[PDB]
Protein: Cyanovirin-N
Organism: Nostoc ellipsosporum
Amino acid sequence: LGKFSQTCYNSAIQGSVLTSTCERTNGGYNTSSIDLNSVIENVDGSLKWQPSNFIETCRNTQLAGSSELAAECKTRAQQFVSTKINLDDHIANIDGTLKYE
Amino acid sequence: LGKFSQTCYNSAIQGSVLTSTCERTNGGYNTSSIDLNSVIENVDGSLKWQPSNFIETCRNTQLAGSSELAAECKTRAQQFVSTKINLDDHIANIDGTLKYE
Ligand SMILES: CCCCCO[C@@H]1O[C@H](CO)[C@@H](O)[C@H](O[C@H]2O[C@H](CO)[C@@H](O)[C@H](O)[C@@H]2O[C@H]2O[C@H](CO)[C@@H](O)[C@H](O)[C@@H]2O)[C@@H]1O
Ligand SMILES: CCCCCO[C@@H]1O[C@H](CO)[C@@H](O)[C@H](O[C@H]2O[C@H](CO)[C@@H](O)[C@H](O)[C@@H]2O[C@H]2O[C@H](CO)[C@@H](O)[C@H](O)[C@@H]2O)[C@@H]1O
Ligand SMILES: [Mg+2]
C-alpha cells in the first residue's frame, strides 16, 4: 500500500494537508491533496494511522437529497441494516473545497 | 460546523468518495471531493462521524525528506514531544490522485 513518493514530486505539508504532483497511469501528471486530519491520530504523543471500517463493512452508498448519505451496514449480529447520516453535520465548504471538521 | 449543502450543487457519492461543486468565498466555483473512507465509521450498523485529535493536539507539522510527516504532539500528560510518521505506509498515488489506503 502507500508509496506515493516513488511516483510523485514537489510535495508539501500545510497544517494537516498534504499536496503533491503525481504521475498518472497515462504518462502525464496531476496535483491533488488529501487532508490528514482524519487519516492519522495522536496516541500519547505518537502519530499513528487511524483505521476505519466504512469501506469494509458497509455497502451500496447513495446520496439522498442534497446532503444525506445512505448505505447498508453490518451490525454486531452480522446482518445488514439501512443507515443514514447527514453530511451537513460536519462537511463544510471552505472556499470551494469540501472539508471534514 | 458543516453545512456544505447550503453553497454546493450537484453533489455525488461514489463508493466512499463525495464530490460536489461549491462556491468560492466570492464567485467562482470549484469542484472537489473528499473520501469519506476516513471520516465515517460504522458502529453496530450505524454510520458515525469518526473523531481524530490530530489537529487538536499536535503542531508544527512538516514534511521531512520525501515522505515523513513530523510534528509535536501532546502526551496524555500534556507535554509536547516530537513525533514522526512515514506517509508512504499508506498514502498512495492512485492514477495521479493521493489516496489513503
Ligand atoms: C458567492 C456569494 C457571495 C456572498 C456570500 O458571502 C458569504 O458571507 C460570509 C463572508 O465570508 C461567509 O459566511 C461566506 O463564506 C461562506 O459561504 C461561502 C460560499 O458562498 C464559502 O466559500 C465560505 O467558506 C463560507 O462558507 C461557510 O458557510 C456556508 C453556509 O453559508 C457553508 O455552506 C460552508 O460549509 C461554510 O461553513 C460567504 O463568503
Ligand atoms: C511506460 C510504461 C508504463 C505503463 C503503465 O504501467 C505502470 O507500471 C505498473 C504496471 O504493472 C504499475 O504499477 C504502474 O502504476 C502505478 O503508478 C502510476 C503512476 O506511475 C499511478 O498512476 C497508479 O495509480 C499506480 O501507482 C502505484 O504505484 C506506485 C509504485 O510504483 C506508487 O508510487 C503509488 O503509490 C501506487 O502504489 C504503472 O501503471
Ligand atoms: Mg479518521
In short: The helical segments of chain B are 54-57. The CA atoms of residues 36 and 74 of chain B lie 26 Å apart. Chain B has one domain: 1-101.
